[PDB]
Amino acid sequence: MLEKKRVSFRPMNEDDLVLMLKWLTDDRVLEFYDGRDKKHTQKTIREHYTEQWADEIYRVIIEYDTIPIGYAQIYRIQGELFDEYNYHETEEKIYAMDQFIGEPEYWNMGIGAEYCRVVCQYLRTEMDADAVILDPRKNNLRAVRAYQKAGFKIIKELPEHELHEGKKEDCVLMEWRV
Ligand SMILES: [Mg+2]
């Protein structure tokens, strides 16, 4: 209302799969998301990024000044996903999220943190969310710090949680609460 809101997001559609291919064949992006040992193709992108591997999944495109610059997937934690995050089963509505900025000229600008704040507020007010959780690699300092700036708190360590570029990486469970 005072300044123009620059960070936004929109639902992903099938036309966005060409951006996903670009981002996930860019070694600069793969260094931080999925890994430079992943060899993506139109086929793998269409398979991974259209799969209904949880009951409630949303895929979104992160935007800056209307420019599409990254991707997020948001899903409700239910069933065995609780055990995957080492998060206790609860009747509260818990969402998990993964995200990346695929356009490196927009890194280190506060966009990821602002995207996290905007989507957390959307989940709270539109989806009746009680909490959002994340599991970044503990040594992905850029991500951890952005999540902390958005109000996520580390609630425990997740040892040997992710294999990334051949190394079993400890992660941290981070939580944002309503
Ligand atoms: Mg994750």
Numbering used by the authors: 1 to 178
From the paper:
The monofunctional counterpart (AAC(6’)-Im) of the acetyltransferase domain of the bifunctional enzyme has been identified in both Gram-negative and Gram-positive clinical isolates 14. It shares 60% sequence identity and 83% similarity with AAC(6’)-Ie. When expressed in the Escherichia coli JM83 strain, AAC(6’)-Im produces resistance to a wide range of clinically important 4,6-disubstituted aminoglycosides with minimal inhibitory concentration (MIC) values 8 - 128-fold above those for the recipient strain.
The AAC(6’)-Im structure was solved in both the apo-form at 1.7 Å resolution, and as the binary complex with kanamycin A (AAC(6’)-Im-kanamycin A) to 1.95 Å resolution. Superposition of the apo-AAC(6’)-Im and AAC(6’)-Im-kanamycin A structures gives an root-mean-square deviation (rmsd) of 0.6 Å. A β-hairpin formed by strand β6’ and the N-terminal end of strand β7 moves inward as a rigid body. In addition, small inward or outward movements of side chains which surround the kanamycin molecule are also observed, primarily to facilitate efficient hydrogen bonding and hydrophobic interactions with the substrate.
